[PDB]
């Protein structure tokens, strides 16, 4: 259990692309999938702000890209809604809605429909 305040230290470094602080936090065992008050994860933050290189390292260090904030949103969805389609392509290589039918959980195609970006998400969907 980490307090509300280092979470934002962690999340600030991701928001700014401070990749060196990210790995520093992790290398001393800071939980990479930690979620603040709003259910946000560091990876969500980095995708929102378009910081590619913090997405690459965050995933390489094992960030679970299928966690959901308290509105049911994923890092993939944040990329969609900020038009960050390079990060979107990376995050969509792992399908967070494979078991949707069972879970009933909000899917990234449905979210894309709500915003008109459905064709693009399709285009970056894996083969």
Domain with residue 114: its CATH number is: 1.25.40.20
Nearest in space to 58 (alpha carbons), one of 85, 90, 83, 104: 90
PDB experimental method: X-ray
> Among 111, 118, 83, 86, which residue's Cα sits nearest to residue 97?
111
Report which of 47, 10, 54 is spatially closest to residue 31, judged by C-alpha positions. Answer: 10
Q: How many domains does the chain have?
A: 1
Domain residue limits at 10: 4-123
By C-alpha distance, which of 66, 127, 55, 121 is closest to 96?
66
Nearest CA among 10, 20, 21 for reference residue 44: 10
Resolution (Å) of this entry: 2.4
């Amino acid at each position: 259990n980490g307090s509300a305040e280092v979470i934002e230290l962690f999340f600030s470094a991701a928001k700014v692309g401070n990749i060196e602080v990210l790995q520093e936090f992790l290398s001393h065992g800071f939980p990479i999938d930690v979620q603040d008050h709003s259910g946000y994860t560091a990876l969500m933050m980095a995708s929102y702000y378009g910081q590619k290189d913090a997405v690459k390292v965050l995933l390489e260090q094992g960030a679970n890209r299928c966690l959901r904030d308290k509105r049911g949103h994923t890092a993939l969805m944040g990329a969609i809604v900020k038009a960050e389609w390079g990060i979107a392509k990376q995050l969509r290589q792992v399908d967070c809605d494979a078991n949707a039918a069972k879970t009933g959980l909000l899917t990234a195609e449905q979210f894309a429909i709500q915003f008109g970006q459905q064709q693009r998400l399709k285009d970056i969907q894996p083969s």
